Every structure is written in structure tokens, then in C-alpha cells.
């Protein structure tokens, strides 16, 4: 691949962004030259995962049929299981997909009852909701594809929605993040795919140039749903859920690595640095309240250590023309005995689908 | 790659059409067929690309460009405005910069440059020109000179591809399915043809031309106006090639009754001998390209490939002419227009062709290629 070289850049305390990147020329054997094979390489220690729930099967096919063969994929369906069951359905269209490929893939539904066992019997209650069960989401699939990602030695793990038309497009995101990691220079990494976003990429560098001083905008990528990033990372970030996930992911770094403090906390961190790396990719977006994701993704930005008092006029007076709701926020999972965790997990849940990983 | 294995097919005489066969996943080193990605890679580099053009939208061409498999050589033949503005000219200026920046081997000339038209005549092949001696305006005639320049450079494969694709992506699978079909070939006689409410009457009617002889109806044939289309050097050179919306399903009726059966084999005893094989993939990506009155001149055009068919039965033919005519495309009386049809390029000296050709033309254009 070839993509246009990282040239221009901002740093934020620990934090740097680089600008958006372009996608020069997709198979290869002022412009980076990734070749194909050291992308095939990063490939297989990437996790895929999908948080997916009631999705067309004809999509989820085509999406599935799409990922490299190298890349391992971790499916965590919260689809509804009865009248009719979907979970059902999907462990079909599952069997059969690895029947004809072989493809190496877990698949478990958000709901399994030994897996909310795993979680509390570990200390690690955040993804709970009021039944004992883990809370329906999108930021809890993806924190349970997430430890499924480490219980299976992943070193990388990108995100790819399910509803997609385009398998093709699929098939670029995870190799533009291989890509946005074979650029990068250190272990905390984050890729995000580029193609209401405005208003929020807004708002998110404005978050910035009120105390930098100077209006930016580096930041383009703030509703990113395709993204991933290195195991290091992912496994020290808190995360959000809902329309807030993408969004959050960046206040919150910046919010704790924008200035050098508790730096004894995340030494490693602070000393290599968070990379995040902005690539435009070379296929459209389509897929298939957006007053919600809206005011979701706004309303992670008004409540911030590091909001102005300033920046949350506006975003208020934006909104109405009665504060945002605080975004729900879940702790990171690094610190949960990954291994106990997945032996409770293998040992109780009725979904766990296993083929060849 | 993996697809579904070619299990299904039907045969007329020398012909023998392939079920169509379904990519069932794409990247792939490792009932299903095992394309190994390493197999395909080293078929590209013998796979000229060629994309006709005419005023596509700079952008499209950019993405379609940047999706083509660096190894596979980019034939282009605009038939692009020369003035008003001169748009070859933002093409040249695209290719360029196209080119500083991934060093893509590729060729592009403009269909009207006399260079090119000195070229035909004084090799003979006047098929191509219309009175004034120039290179007559069509995607027919545009396929044709890729497919000398093809030849020109050494190409073994060629491979078709539009301009004007939405997805880069399906650009990119293209190629590798146009590989997958040849690499499962046994002829080297092979056409690939892909697939994804007109090219279901072409298909109806181009099965039904056989089914007329075989006096069993099929639906083998699904494929009848697939622009995406790939085949070898060795049967693109010996097909007559019609031009506008009459080309893909054209070649069809022409390889049907050429070599549906068995006679004159000595004209073509190589051909008889090793068969010629089509196969038809069904894409993983869907068809998403950039109006409606082309829509029904594509349908009074493919009709019309086999309506004038020497295989075509009266049958066949009034059931045109009515379904046609019930569409309101075609007059009460009148029978549809027969197809434009240059031949073979087989007999024209590829050699003293292209010198012709790149001693002369002032629009051809060269980077590594």
C-alpha cells in the first residue's frame, strides 16, 4: 500500500495526532511505501472484532467473507434471542461461513449468563446492569470482544461494523490499520477511519484551541466508528458506550495525557507516547436519532476536566438553539486476571462458538 | 481467494459455459475452490488492464487508478472532449500526477489522435475508421486499440474495467476475480465475466437462443451485458468485436455460432482443440457506477446481437421483436438496427503497427510502459 506520508502533526502533552492521511494506491508490492507483506504480517496478531445485534445476515456475510483469512474475528452478538432467536440464526450463517472457509473465529451472545459470572467473580462489576446480566450496548460487546481479543494473545484489535455494503471496504479498514500501526513509532497507537461528524470534529478541536490558543483542525476522525489500536492501549482506556464511545475515546485522552501529571501512573505511557493516526480511506461509507448521537457526542466533550467554561456556552446554546446527560463510563479492563476471567468464561457460557482459535 | 468450485457447466460443441461461481472469501494464502493470493499476483503482472474512457469524472478515475494492482500495466484509451475545455488534456495532467506518485506502469492515448488512425490504415485495417479516415468514436473501437497496445507490450490477459466505479474496491476485486477465473481455467482460450432488469432479458434471450437448438431451456447464461469482463490475449485477438451496448452480449452469440459446433475446424483447429471456456464470477462487492434513455438503447442494442444471430430462429426472433416493441423501443414494423462488427486483430502486424503508432501518434503517452 502506499498512503501519503505523515508530515504535519500536533502535540498535546503526551498526546500527538497526526494529520489525515490519504490512500495513495491499494496493492503494492511525500508518500509511505507499506508494503503488502508487512501488512499481512501485523494481520494475524489483529483481532477483529464485531459487536454486532440484529443485523442483516446477507451483510454480516458479506462483511465476514471480507476479513483477511490471517485475521482472527471475535463476533459479540447482543441479538435478540427469541420470537424469533437471531443468536440462532447467526451461529448458523457462523458454522456455515467457517464450514466453507475455515476462518478462525469466536462468536458468544452479550447476554450469556456465564459470562456475567466471569465478570463480577473477578471484581469487575462496571458492565453490569440491575438483573445481574451484562448491560445491552455497543461499549460492552466491545469490551467483551476486547478480553476475548487478550484471552487469545492479540496484540492489535480493530473495530468493523457488521451492517456494511461494501465487503470491499471492509476488507481496506483492516488492512488501513495494519497500515496506521507499521507508521507508527510506539506501543500505544490508535487508527481511525475517515470518509453532525463535523459537529463534533468541531467541537473536539475547539475542546483544544481553548488553551492552546490557536483554532486547529487536526481532528477529523471524532465519530470514527472504524477504528482500532494496540492491546497496550485499548486495555488502559476507560470506555463509554452508545454514540459517546468514538468521541469519548479522544476527550479522554487528552483529558489525561494532554498535560504530564500522575505520569508515576502510566509511566510507559507518558514516556512512548499515544500515537493517533487519521487515515481517509479510498472506499464511501454505507451501511444499514441522530439528535442523539448528537447530543451524546457533545455532551462528552461539555463534561470534561478540560472543557472551558467558555466552550460549554456554546455547546449548550448549540444544543437548545437543562445540561447534557453525563456519559456513562465503564473502567478500563487491564486490570482484570484475564486468564481467571476466560477459564470462568469457557467453563459457563451456553454461546461460546470456538472454530479454530 | 476462495470460491465456490466450478462443479456445474453446459457444453455446445467447442464451447463450454461454467455455472457461475461465487467468491466465498477474499483474502487467501492457505465444493471450494483454493486460489492461492501468491497465484493470482504473479497472473496480474501478465494482465494489461484496459479502461475505455470518455469524460468520466476526474475523481472516479483517480479511485479506480489508485485500486488497480500496481502490477497490473494500465491501458488507457480516452475518447475524451478535445476543446471547450480540452479534457484529455486534465487527464494527461491526472495520469501524471497519478503516476509521481505511485509509479503505476501505464500507457494512455486519445481514440482521435491520427497517429493512431495512420496506424490502421496503413496496415489495412480499415474496419476501425469511419470517411474522413479517422478513428471512429465508440467503447468497440476503444476496446480495440487497448487490445493492440495490449498486444503491443505483451500482455497475455487483458481485463476491462469502467472508469466511472463508485467503489475502488470492487475495481480491485475485479482484476483478482478476472485472475481467479483464468487460474482455474484449462483452455487457454478463457473469458471471465462477472456478475452481481435488462441484463435479465439479454439473459433471457441469449439462453433461449440455445435452448431453441437444445430444445432445453437453461439458465446457464447470467452474464449477457457484463462490461467487467477479462480474457486471453489468444481468444480476444481472434473475436470480431461490435461496438456501444451490442459488445458483451455480442461476443457471446458470435462464440456460439462460431464454435457451438464442430466445421471449418481447420480455421481454427487450435481453438476446436483446447475449447473455449467461459467462466462467470459473482463479485463480492455490489455495482455501484455514475440515465434511462441509454438504458433502453442498451436493451434495443443487445437484442438486436442476437436477433441478427445466425443461430436465431424465427421463434426467437418475432418473441425480439415483440417484447421489444412492447417496450415501446422499437417501431411497429421496423426490426432492430444489425450490429457494427470491425474483426479479428489477429492478421494486423502487431510490429509495424506500433511503430506506426509511436512514431506518429502526438497523444500517446508512457511511464514505465
Same mark, same amino acid.
Given at each position: 500500500?502506499?498512503?501519503? #506520508? ?23 508490492? %511525500? ?20 459487536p ?67 465478570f463480577?467473580?473477578?471484581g469487575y462489576t462496571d458492565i453490569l446492569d440491575?438483573?445481574?446480566?451484562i448491560r445491552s450496548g455497543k461499549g460492552e460487546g466491545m469490551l467483551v470482544?476486547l478480553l ?13 461494523? #457488521? ?15 495494519? #497500515? ?24 473536539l478541536?475547539?475542546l483544544?484551541?481553548?488553551?492552546? #490558543? ?8 471524532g ?6 489500536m494496540?492491546?497496550?492501549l485499548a486495555e488502559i482506556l476507560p470506555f463509554s458506550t452508545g454514540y459517546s464511545i468514538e468521541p469519548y475515546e479522544i476527550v479522554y485522552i487528552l483529558e489525561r495525557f ?7 501512573e502510566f ?25 442523539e448521537?448528537?447530543l451524546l457526542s457533545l455532551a462528552t466533550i461539555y463534561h470534561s476536566k478540560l472543557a ?15 445540561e447534557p446527560p453525563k456519559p456513562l463510563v465503564m473502567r478500563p479492563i487491564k486490570e482484570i ?13 451456553? %454461546? ?6
Amino acid at each position: 500500500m502506499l498512503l501519503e #506520508a505523515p508530515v504535519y502533526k500536533e502535540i498535546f502533552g503526551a498526546v500527538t495526532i497526526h494529520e489525515v492521511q490519504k490512500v495513495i494506491k491499494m496493492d503494492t508490492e %511525500t508518500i509511505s511505501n507499506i508494503p503488502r507483506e508487512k501488512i499481512y504480517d501485523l494481520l494475524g496478531k489483529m483481532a477483529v472484532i464485531v459487536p454486532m445485534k440484529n443485523e442483516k445476515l446477507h451483510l454480516v456475510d458479506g462483511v465476514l467473507k471480507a476479513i483477511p483469512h490471517k485475521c482472527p474475528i471475535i463476533i459479540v452478538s447482543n441479538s435478540k434471542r427469541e420470537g424469533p432467536n437471531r443468536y440462532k440464526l447467526e451461529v448458523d450463517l457462523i458454522r456455515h461461513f467457517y464450514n466453507l472457509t475455515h476462518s478462525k473465529i469466536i462468536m458468544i451472545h452479550q447476554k450469556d449468563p456465564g459470562l456475567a459470572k466471569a465478570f463480577k467473580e473477578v471484581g469487575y462489576t462496571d458492565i453490569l446492569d440491575e438483573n445481574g446480566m451484562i448491560r445491552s450496548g455497543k461499549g460492552e460487546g466491545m469490551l467483551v470482544g476486547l478480553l476475548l481479543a487478550k484471552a487469545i494473545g492479540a496484540e492489535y484489535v480493530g473495530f468493523v461494523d #457488521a451492517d456494511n455494503y461494501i465487503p470491499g471496504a471492509v476488507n481496506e479498514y483492516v488492512k488501513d490499520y495494519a #497500515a496506521g500501526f507499521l507508521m507508527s513509532e510506539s506501543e500505544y497507537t490508535m487508527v481511525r477511519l475517515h470518509w453532525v461528524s463535523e459537529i463534533t470534529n468541531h467541537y473536539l478541536n475547539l475542546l483544544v484551541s481553548e488553551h492552546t #490558543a490557536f483554532e486547529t483542525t487536526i481532528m477529523v476522525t471524532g465519530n470514527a466508528g472504524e477504528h482500532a489500536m494496540t492491546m497496550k492501549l485499548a486495555e488502559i482506556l476507560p470506555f463509554s458506550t452508545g454514540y459517546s464511545i468514538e468521541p469519548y475515546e479522544i476527550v479522554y485522552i487528552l483529558e489525561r495525557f494532554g498535560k504530564w501529571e500522575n505520569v508515576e501512573e502510566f509511566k510507559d505511557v507518558f514516556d512512548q507516547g499515544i500515537e493517533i493516526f487519521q487515515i481517509e480511506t479510498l472506499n464511501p461509507h454505507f451501511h444499514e436519532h441522530v439528535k442523539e448521537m448528537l447530543l451524546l457526542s457533545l455532551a462528552t466533550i461539555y463534561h470534561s476536566k478540560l472543557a472551558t467554561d467558555n466552550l460549554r456556552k456554546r455547546i449548550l446554546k448549540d444544543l437548545r438553539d437543562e445540561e447534557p446527560p453525563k456519559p456513562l463510563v465503564m473502567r478500563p479492563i487491564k486490570e482484570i486476571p484475564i486468564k481467571e476471567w476466560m477459564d470462568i468464561v469457557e467453563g459457563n457460557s451456553e %454461546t461460546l462458538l470456538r472454530f479454530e482459535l
